[PDB]
Amino acid sequence: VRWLAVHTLAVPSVFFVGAIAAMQFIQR
Amino acid sequence: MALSDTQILAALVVALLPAFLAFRLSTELYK
Amino acid sequence: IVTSIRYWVIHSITIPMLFIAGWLFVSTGLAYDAFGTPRPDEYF
Amino acid sequence: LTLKIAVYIVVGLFISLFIFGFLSSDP
Amino acid sequence: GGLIGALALILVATAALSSYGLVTFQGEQGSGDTLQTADGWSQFAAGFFVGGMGGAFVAYFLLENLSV
Amino acid sequence: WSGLLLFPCAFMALGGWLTGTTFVTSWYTHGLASSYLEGANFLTVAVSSPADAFGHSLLFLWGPEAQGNLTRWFQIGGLWPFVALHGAFGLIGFMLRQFEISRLVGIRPYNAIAFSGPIAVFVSVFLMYPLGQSSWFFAPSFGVAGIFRFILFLQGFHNWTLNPFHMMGVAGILGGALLCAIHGATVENTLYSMVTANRFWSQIFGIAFSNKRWLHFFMLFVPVTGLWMSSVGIVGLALNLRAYDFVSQELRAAEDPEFETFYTKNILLNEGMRAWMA
Amino acid sequence: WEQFCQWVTSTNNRIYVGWFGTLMIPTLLTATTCFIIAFIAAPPVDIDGIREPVAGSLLYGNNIISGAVVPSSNAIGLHFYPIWEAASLDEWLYNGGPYQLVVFHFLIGIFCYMGRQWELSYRLGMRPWICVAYSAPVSAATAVFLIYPIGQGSFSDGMPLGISGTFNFMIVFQAEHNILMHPFHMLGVAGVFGGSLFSAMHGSLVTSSLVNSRSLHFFLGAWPVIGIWFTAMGVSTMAFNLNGFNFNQSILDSQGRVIGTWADVLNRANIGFEVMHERNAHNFPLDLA
Amino acid sequence: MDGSYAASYLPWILIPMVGWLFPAVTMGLLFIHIESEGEG
Ligand code: CLA
Ligand code: CLA
Ligand code: CLA
Ligand SMILES: C=Cc1c(C)c2cc3nc(c4c5[nH]c(cc6nc(cc1[nH]2)C(C)=C6CC)c(C)c5C(=O)[C@@H]4C(=O)OC)[C@@H](CCC(=O)OC/C=C(\C)CCC[C@H](C)CCC[C@H](C)CCCC(C)C)[C@@H]3C
Ligand SMILES: CC1=C(/C=C/C(C)=C\C=C\C(C)=C\C=C\C=C(C)\C=C\C=C(C)\C=C\C2=C(C)C(=O)CCC2(C)C)C(C)(C)C[C@H](O)C1
Ligand SMILES: [Fe+2]
């Protein structure tokens, strides 16, 4: 349903963008 | 007649280019 | 009504903790370990 | 050098004709 | 509204803590005090974030009527 | 019906591409860093093709090439077959989706026959070419830079420009772009309103358009035909290299230092490019 | 004489002329004639200033694909080389002056074709977006035929008027400039791809209905034009020794050794193209009899 | 707040970014840069 249709994309995207945000700092 | 929202979005997309050019110029001037 | 309140509460619990979970996952030595990606020190 | 002169007059007359016609556009 | 304000404040607090940790202990590292080191301060900031969320949410659960 | 047969597969392909572009590495498959984690940027990141250590094995998760492990399954490069196969499955699913939408509405399916071109392009470039090749290590990577590297490799090893099929595909692509631009421009010019444009082209281009349906068919048909011929040419390259090489000019130029043709210089570039990688 | 001008500006002629056509037709006809003659029977045009003449004419042993109107000589450089500056016809033929004449008269002709298009469009009572669309191929042709030779400082490295010449020019361009990594060729690629996509979709929609459209057609026609404008500007920038992104050796390790990315492989391929052989210390035969 | 101009949702997100996200990010980066020791 619409609930899954939105959450299946939303719930990993925030995780991934937080990951990339941290990688933007982990670089020496 | 008033502007259309597509015009506003296109204006933002166009304005993306001077932002990138300005970033490049500033980084060049930093050296 | 109360439904919107619960919607806001549910969307406030999860988003910050998810972002911070991602940040913690890649900040510690977990991203390299799980995915097999080598850390920059080991490179030869 | 005669070819140079011929080309000069040809191109000059062509451009002069074009500009003269454009300035007196009938329609 | 109180919950949202508290969550925003705790988020900004964690950002400030992380920035302080990044800029303070980036030189030589010692283990005499485990709080005054880059990894220790980063762990402190992460735990501080999660504790802030927990405390704000438990306070909201106590104050807010019903909603269950 | 089939509209739910592609959504999970397409979403899984997208998720696999996103996971590969930021976490997995190509150190044990190409000796390169190809994700954000190592320090690569948007243009550099790529889901690299599998290494040349297995051949045509698909590197399944439950297959013995990884034995259920995930770190190994990512290091062996099974993410490339995962992404490519799921993407192809979802793409044929959308083919059937357009088919069934047309069936439900009751009009002739023309979006499907047009979309067939991308299907052929994908199945030829990413699946059939490596099948005709030694293994997946020569298959193109899922990256902006990987695509360019694959293009240059095919130029070096096949002289793909000289192939008639890529030539006619280039013609089809450029004709499609020209027809798109000209149709949009003429519509916003007359903004029926066809007689004005028809007279304008009859007096400008001489050979004007008979009807707007004819022009719409032509802009539908030129790029799809170009893509189909390009895919057929790649498939031929897999089986039988269809490059008309004028060996007469080659011999004429080999021992005559006073003769040269741009074909000879293209051959020089190709053979030097071959010799460059030993 | 007024009858002649009345016919010229007449919107009733079988093939329209207009006042721009009065200058378009001679230039286009001249360009076609001299291009055909140069394609058929031009002598071997030396192109690099060394003892390696290059032949691009059919009568000199070339087929249709291999035929190409050879660019000018490196001896010419960027200098204007008309026939009267040639002490005789043979030197002008052997120095690639036909190429310069063709390109100059053809550029004038396409500009006048634009003018004729606009003139007919306004005389017919229509807002002229057709020339706004037609400007993109003209801009690309000018960038790749006039701007690039000037930026590179010579007419020798211009695109030959031939199928094989086009491929050689493109490959040498990629080797010397890395156009693929430059964002503006990607903008052009996206423009042409979107043009093809919109063509296919719009044709399918119209034919499936055979028995927002305004802005739809507007953006449909506008995307490829903008893409072509951007790629022409990119080529013009590349003319003055500007190149695409160089992400090579941009990732190191804890010690300082390069890790390598796909951009590094692209750079290696470009270097391989720009020298059509191997590198040093690859065991040349030491002793020869 | 809302208005009758086209794309009325743009201020809703653009203004908070230019008011909170952008200032926070730039001050964070500037504080990090002005404090990096060595390499004077
Ligand atoms: C200066 C303008 C110009 C012209 C006339 C051509 C013409 C041609 N190009 Mg070309 N090209 C150009 C610029 C030009 N190109 C530029 C700037 C680039 C990028 C650097 C390329 C890159 C390119 C590639 C990569 C390829 C071609 C190919 C071709 C040929 C067929 C494809 C085609 O045009 O169909 C699209 C256009 C149309 C369908 C519109 C109609 C055009 C007519 C049919 C072409 C005939 C014109 C002819 C040259 C006129 C000569 C004089 C006349 C008296 C005979 C054709 C001879 C292909 C090829 O080699 O095939 C032989 C091919 O693979 N071109
Ligand atoms: C998927 C692969 C792909 C694709 C789709 C493209 C696509 C493109 N490339 Mg590209 N390229 C690629 C791979 C690819 N490239 C690779 C791998 C390389 C490395 C070798 C290059 C190297 C490269 C170079 C070096 C250049 C391009 C250019 C272009 C653009 C062509 C613009 C053009 O023809 O001018 C528009 C069309 C014309 C100018 C034709 C003339 C039109 C006039 C107005 C009419 C002429 C009529 C004719 C003379 C006679 C009429 C016919 C009839 C009536 C008789 C286009 C966006 C060119 C560019 O950016 O353009 C500026 C360019 O210079 N590419
Ligand atoms: C310097 C010129 C300038 C200025 C002072 C403003 C001022 C404003 N714009 Mg605006 N805007 C501009 C140019 C400008 N605009 C341009 C060129 C565009 C087209 C892309 C827009 C598009 C735009 C939109 C779509 C919206 C605004 C909105 C607003 C208001 C919210 C605050 C804001 O700027 O953040 C939002 C504005 C932006 C993110 C615009 C980007 C900044 C522009 C493109 C360049 C500015 C660079 C500048 C010279 C840097 C100087 C540095 C200096 C301080 C040291 C504010 C009144 C919002 C509004 O009206 O709310 C009611 C809104 O929704 N603007
Ligand atoms: C330039 C590249 C290009 C892209 C990106 C593209 C994309 C799209 N076109 C579609 C439609 C169409 N395309 C058409 C004609 C054309 N389309 C073309 C070229 C493209 N078309 C060309 C050249 C033509 C002319 C023949 C038609 C006629 C249609 C439609 O009817 C349809 C539409 O309505 O559009 C609005 C949609 C396909 C939906 C689908 O199959 O769901 C399934 C989605 C899947 C399976 C996900 C794709 C995953 C892929 C296969 C593998 C993964 C790829 C990575 C994630 C990305 C890698 C990136 C690297 C290159 C760096 C989508 C918006
Ligand atoms: C008790 C104690 C100590 C002593 C403290 C004493 C005596 C006083 C301290 C007072 C303090 C710290 C007061 C702090 C006030 C903070 C304010 C006023 C914050 C306001 C925030 C607002 C209004 C935020 C608004 C917004 C948020 C949250 C956003 O994210 C953006 C939007 C917006 C701007 C609206 C010390 C000795 C310092 C340390 C010891 O451990 C504990
Ligand atoms: Fe239409």
Residue of H5, H33, H34 to mutate, testing the B interface (most B Cβ within 10 Å of its Cβ): H5
Residue G182: closest CA among G244, G139, G134: G244
Query: Hey, what are F78's tokens?
Result: 């099974």
Contact E9 CB / ligand 5 (< 6 Å): yes
Burial class of residue H4, CB neighbours in 10 A (0-12, 13-18, 19+): exposed
| G23 CB within 8 Å of a chain D CB | yes
Task: Mark yes or no for CB contact H6/B9 under 8 Å.
Answer: no
Say if CB G198 and CB G220 are below 8 A apart.
yes
Cα(G17)–Cα(F198) distance, rounded to whole angstroms? 17
**Residue C3's closest chain E neighbor by CA?**
E67
Name the domain count of chain H.
1
Pair E12, H20: CB distance under 8 Å: no
Three-class DSSP labels, chain F: CCHHHHHHHHHHHHHHHHHHCCCCCECCCCCECCCCCCCCCCCCCEECCCCCCCCCCCCCCCCCCCCCCCHHHHHCCCHHHHHHHHHHHHHHHHHHHHHHHHHHHCCCCCHHHHHHHHHHHHHHHHHHHHHHCCCHHHCCCEEHHHHHHHHHHHHHHHCHHHCHHHHHHHHHHHHHHHHHHHHHHHHHHHCCCHHHHHHHHHHHCCCCCCCHHHHHHHHHHHHHHHHHHHHHHHHHHHHCCCCCCCHHHHHHHHCCCCCCCHHHHHHHHHHHHHHHCC
Task: Identify the DSSP state of G85.
Answer: G
Cβ count within 10 A of residue G152: 19
G206: CA distance to ligand 6 center in Å?
A: 7
C-beta of residue F179 within 8 angstroms of C-beta of residue F188: no
Residues of chain B numbered 1-31 and touching chain G (CB < 8 Å) = 4, 6
* Chain G from 109 to 128: CB within 8 A of any F CB: 116-117, 120-121, 124-128
G243 near F146, Cβ under 8 Å? no
- G277 is written with which tokens? 């052989």
Instruction: Domain of residue H20: give its range.
Output: 1-40
Contact A/C (≥3 CB pairs under 8 Å): yes
Q: Which of G223, G220, G186, G222 is CA-nearest to residue G200?
A: G220
Residue nearest to atom 17 of ligand 5 (CA): E9
Long-range contacts of E11-19 (CB under 8 A, 24+ apart): E11/C16, E11/E49, E12/H24, E13/E48, E13/E52, E14/C20, E14/E45, E14/E48, E14/E49, E14/E52, E15/H24, E15/H28, E17/E41, E17/E44, E17/E45, E17/E48, E18/E42, E18/E45, E19/H28, E19/H31, E19/H32
* C-beta separation of G31 from F227 below 8 A: no
Contact G257 C44 (CB under 8 A): yes
F182 C-alpha to ligand 3 centroid (Å): 35
Could you say which ligand is closest to the alpha carbon of residue G176?
A: 2
Q: E67 and C2: CB-CB below 8 Å? A: yes
- The answer to whether F225 touches F176, Cβ cutoff 8 Å, is no
Cα–Cα distance for residue pair F205/G12, rounded to 1 Å = 14
> For ligand 5, what atom is nearest to the CA of residue H20?
31
- CA gap G266, G250 in Å, rounded: 14
Q: Which residue of G24, G231, G242, G266 sits with most ligand 2 atoms within 8 Å of its CB, as the best mutation to test the pocket?
A: G231
* Residue extents of the structural domains in chain C: 1-44
A5 in helix, strand or coil? helix
Does the beta-carbon distance from A14 to C31 stay under 8 Å?
no
Q: Method of determination?
A: cryo-EM
Token pair for G40: 């058929």
A28 assigned ligand-binding residue: no
Ligand-binding site membership of G182 (annotated): no
Angstrom distance (rounded) from CA F54 to CA F59: 8
Select the residue of G9, G20, G23 nearest D26 (Cβ to Cβ): G9
- Residues of chain F with Cβ-Cβ distance to A1 below 8 Å are none
Q: Which CATH class, in words, describes the domain spanning C1-44? A: mainly alpha
Helix (H, G, I), strand (E, B) or coil at G69: strand
Residue F34 to residues F19, G178, H2, Cα–Cα distance (Å) = 12, 20, 45
Burial code (b: 16+ CB inside 10 Å, e: under 16) for B1-31 equals eeeeeeeeeeeeeeeeeeeeeeeeeeeeeee
What six digits make up the tokens of E23? 């800029």
Judged by phi (left if over 0) then psi (alpha if -120 to 50, else beta), residue C28 lies in: beta
SS3 E67: coil
Q: Which of E11, E14, E57 sits opposite C13 (nearest CB)?
A: E57
Q: Is E22 in the pocket of ligand 5 (CB under 6 A)?
A: no
Q: Which residues pair with G162 in a beta bridge?
A: G68
Which of chain F's residues have a Cβ under 8 Å away from the Cβ of A23?
22, 36-37
Nearest alpha carbon to residue F32 among F190, F178, F146, F193: F146
Please tell me if the CB atom of residue G38 comes closer than 6 angstroms to any atom of ligand 2: no
Q: In this structure, what token pair is assigned to residue F40?
A: 């690569």
- If you count them, how many residues does chain C have? 44
For residue G17, give the DSSP letter.
-
List the single residue in B with minimal CA-CA distance to G222.
B10
Which amino acid is it at F237? L
Q: Which of D1, D7, D21 sits opposite G22 (nearest CB)?
A: D21
* Residue G67 φ then ψ, to 5°: -75, 140
**CB atoms inside a 10 Å sphere around CB F141:** 24
Q: What does the alpha-carbon distance between residue G109 and residue G227 come to, in Å, rounded to a whole number?
A: 24
**F208 contacts F186 by C-beta, under 8 angstroms:** no
Element (H, E) at G161: strand G161-162
In chain G, what residues touch C43 (CB-CB under 8 Å)?
A: 253-255, 257, 259
